[PDB]
Symmetry: C4
Subunit: 389 residues, 4 copies
């Protein structure tokens, strides 16, 4: 007995409890902490890990100068245990990557890193610490993936990739792998729809993803993947937009099928089905990546509901946030009969918003519980500028 | 076979042998050492760990500026092995917390961290590295806990919490948990009595705690918890006060039922029943947190005894001390038939007493043995001010 | 079940996927990273490790002054997991050595370090973390070895050593060991031929090595070792030279038996048999250790072929490279039926080519896959000079 | 199966091969390395560890100022794997101690640290990471022990302690322990003889120690302990003195029963019985702690032999040495049928000999092999003064 089932329903939860906080930038003032982005969480049967992209550079060093390309040859995926800062001396090497996803099937870690050139990039699949397969760019335009946990059901692991334009129609694929080896792929037909940077989780033996529309939608697309790779694709039905930037709530009319709101740009974000309701994350500000709030919509997975019945602030609107993503706790760690829904929020510090040569981020992680949880702000807390500035 | 019984009597001991000393502040002059408070010890079947609260900041860095609130959003519970300094690169993440307790039931670590807002704070229970339950503030006034080892008997783990005023009547609860899940709670009726920051241990299959009175008592309250959660509550009978600040010994009349001494303030401290005698810890000074001595009182658990029959100095009255707390060694590590009683002393350095921007502490840990042990001073030993000062 | 068989054929592969990159020098600007050379990779059943030679000195420290002899008494072999920087606090001690090889037989690591004086040096064999045997210099002229993975087949581990002149005829031996103990040696007769710094791998139950000629050959010698230690020895047949320095390709006529090209000097490098084809590594420049390319030659293992059918650039010719070496993934990690061929490239920074007091290197590791992989440059990326300069 | 037998003869060896070298001071110029003394080696069934005494202070920090007492309250015993520098972030806490011994019985580590006051000091026995027993000073004059590996035979572990004057008659005891608990002690009658800082090893099911005479002997005492604690005591028979300081070899007449040479002072050192021969370590200089040489004396364990038949220099007489001590490799690591004899040499840097505020040391470790090994110098190699100077 070794593979995780993950065929159970997602736990229905009234609130989200603080899991961990790494304080990485604050520690980085003096300690040896990588400059990072996308601090995503994923879990095995023994514990949860925080994954992150590095530039081979440390905070308070000249190499942190953020003029370096995002898609550089120095870009690597590394990991630490959840709540550990992304420090050099505890870190584990996962992949060469400027885009990533990772997940644990119950026996080993699977990690996928995209590197190489824009026009012909390479996704290298790792399983158990070594390359086992690859996917080459199929559309020759920045092959890329979730930047969050992929999802593993019964020994088969699932993720979503995109190749094509960052601001108009692109192409989308879902992938399936067992023990490091790709055993199926499907092209997701979604004309007029855009998909990036999906936040996925298991629920009831399917994969559900809530992704980012970077073309015209201030709502988030939703992708529901069956193990045979038939999928359903559309938009989160709810009548509140959860992308950033977005328009006022009052203005918004939702749509189960179309992007709405007619604005470009975006941020990675997430949501969890709760029967027919939905929990949705978003920044507080509609115009910038500041603040973090999670909102439950009555019937918001099946209807263009604006029925808000819960709201918990996790980062206040005076503080910088960023990407967020989803994962779940396995049953063997949680001890429950359902899959506990959890999320992470990245808190971006430095350039552009602040006068620094560098940019990094830290995180606050939260897990669904059966109780209301009070509002508070678990913000980054670093004091900028730093010495190297 | 996995759960620890801890149903055995506490070892009767004539003295306390040095276990470990981390030298954390001294190392922090150059190494990457968290700024800490409450360095409590707790043990599993494989070893003992030192837990501590951090601020996400390191010694000799600007983030150590101690103007930050105690109950900040950066506050986390972390741990290292006993005698390791609270350094970043060996540390293990336990909880987001500005108040904590932890203990090991024989299979996994249970850790409890309180964070969130004063008026509606959240205790998050961790078991095996993940959230499994919570307790929300029931009195909306700084929900808080032991800052020391909780106690585990036969797979059920016990701790004490307080919600209410820091200087007058507050409310007190005891909690019981199995595998991360709360299975019972009881309100402790104690009118006119105050309870904070309890130091508890197993003895004979009950939980005994020696807590801090921050209202009127220079004596320490005592709480004795049966596994069904019926409890006995009162004050340590002995005719010597062990709180700080306190009045002269000669002045003092003890009380098995009431606080005595009629002074406010306090410090976390401890004691161990020895049949009907008691070992009690206290600072040497009656007015400040300087020095550390442990005293055995003949019949001091059952009578208002002033019969002192042993005294061992562990920190001299020229050196700063602080909180102290209790724990026990499991039988599987100790190899004995009784539960060895052990304690830790925190040694506070920096503000208020010394001219620094920061405040941290280090520790000396001691374990009961069957021999008299000579007086000495295992003091912190750091040389202040530091560079950042 | 514990010993690795490694009796399987080498995987036939169309390309090489990025495995890892440590970014060691970049991190060394601020972190505590050894000054290194020869960052070779070798793997066990549980993972792959990067081995390296240190000088007991760190980057950005006065001890990194590179006036110290290469064959100094401070020289040690240490290791980290693949893709971890050669940092002090994750490193594992392997041997005292200014020349090395290491490999894992399926039960334990075998490590061999040469130290001591030029005229009578000592190779100390380590197995399972302790000395188990030695080989003393047999020719009293810088006893030395592969600086890469040795090769283990069925519990017996194989390596090649050289004792004698660095620029003319020297003497060569192959060694065989089980559980740390030498069980056979053979002198390799190779008059007029030179062998240094062999890069070997298992294939079909023999050991094949592609070594460096430092006397007259711009082609590489090839050594094929049977388990009874009979061997075949000659030169890589192919009509393209893969040493550096070398002459133009157009000029070159290959030879299965003789060194060709009539130039001295050299660099450690590698190649893999693919049935009758060969993959060969080389620097891009013919005159300096800049760039890295891998080329497949149709029939290049059996014929003086110039039939190039694949070429993948891994480091561009604007960036410094260095030594390269080979290893293979075990079947138990890879999950395949063949031995996946992998290599590493060292990227040298600092003196001579650059104005620094020091010299170190970092690495990019690559593994054979069943797909073409696009050209790119995974270069070191450090920004020199450093502070200590 | 868990306890080590260690009832086998000591391997007869013709030379000593380099095991490891930590380079600790050199790394300490930039890394976070404890200021140490007595870097002794001891081994379990899984590997060998280097133990060391720290002051809670790091190299290049103001706390390294060596005005601090040797017997301070900050003094702790810590350990790392053999060949790792004594760095903070890999170190393991063993005991509070300004004098120590440690050894592994096959199941757990036993560690013994002496701390507390000169006139009534406490040895705390640790087994499996916790206190299990103590020995209080019996003569009220600096209770102290080997500063090297103790010796474990069949689950019973043996060490030697001294209480009394450092320069004239003192009292000596041998101790026996199983699973952390003292099960026997014996007073060693040795009138006119002095014993300090014994270097012991198992051989043929007894414990043999070669100790330091700090009173009148430039020869070393020898102690042979049977498992029932009857002992034989005398001096190493050989006609060459191995203490430092000592008189010329030519002058010396050995003695199996008496100290000879009539000089005070001393240094910890070692020797190994080889049937009736002896290997003996000593500094090269007769007047200072410089150089290291090992010499085999024909019949030197049973006769006042001056028959020198082997000599291997390990540190040259231009370089600082210091204490040395003995240990053995277990059969389960070594794979042999005899106990391999190994030793360590400490290389002292800084005050007194050099102009520094601090004093620390590094080490070179060596293990017996069946071959002559060439002369060389594996010296410390640090470049003093350091910055803090
Ligand atoms: Ca959008
Ligand atoms: Ca009080
Ligand atoms: Ca050549
Ligand atoms: Ca002497």
């Amino acid at each position: 007995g070794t593979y995780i089932n993950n065929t159970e329903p997602i736990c229905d939860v009234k609130g989200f409890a603080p899991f961990s906080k790494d304080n990485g930038i604050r520690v980085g003032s003096r300690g040896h902490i990588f400059v990072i982005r996308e601090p995503f969480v994923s879990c095995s049967p023994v514990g949860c890990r925080t994954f992150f992209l590095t530039q081979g550079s440390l905070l308070n060093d000249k190499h942190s100068n953020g003029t370096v390309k995002d898609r550089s040859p120095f870009r690597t995926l590394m990991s630490v245990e959840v709540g550990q800062s992304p420090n050099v001396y505890q870190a584990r090497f996962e992949a060469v990557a400027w885009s990533a996803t990772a997940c644990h099937d119950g026996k080993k870690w699977m990690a996928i890193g995209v590197t190489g050139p824009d026009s012909k990039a390479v996704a290298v699949v790792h399983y158990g610490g070594v390359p086992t397969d690859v996917v080459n760019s199929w559309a020759g335009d920045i092959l890329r993936t979730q930047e969050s946990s992929c999802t593993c059901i019964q020994g088969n692991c699932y993720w979503v990739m995109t190749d094509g334009p960052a601001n108009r129609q692109a192409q989308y694929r879902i992938y399936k792998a067992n023990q490091g080896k790709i055993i199926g792929r499907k092209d997701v037909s979604f004309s007029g729809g855009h998909i990036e940077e999906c936040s996925c989780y298991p629920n009831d033996g399917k994969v559900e993803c809530v992704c980012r529309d970077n073309w015209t939608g201030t709502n988030r697309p939703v992708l529901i993947i069956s193990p045979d790779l038939s999928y359903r694709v559309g938009y989160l039905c709810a009548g509140l937009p959860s992308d950033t930037p977005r328009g006022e709530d009052t203005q918004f009319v939702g749509s189960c099928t179309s992007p709405m709101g007619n604005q470009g740009y975006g941020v990675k974000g997430f949501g969890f089905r709760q029967g027919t309701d939905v929990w949705v994350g978003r920044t507080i500000s509609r115009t910038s990546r500041s603040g973090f709030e999670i909102i439950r919509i009555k019937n918001g997975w099946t209807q263009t509901s604006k029925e808000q019945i819960r709201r918990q602030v996790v980062v206040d609107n005076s503080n910088w946030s960023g990407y967020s993503g989803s994962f779940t706790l396995p049953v063997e760690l949680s001890g429950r009969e359902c899959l506990v829904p959890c999320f992470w929020v990245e808190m971006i510090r430095g350039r552009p918003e602040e006068r620094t040569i560098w940019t990094s981020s830290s995180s606050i992680v939260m897990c669904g519980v059966d109780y209301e949880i009070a509002d508070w702000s678990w913000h980054d807390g670093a004091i900028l500028p730093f010495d190297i500035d």
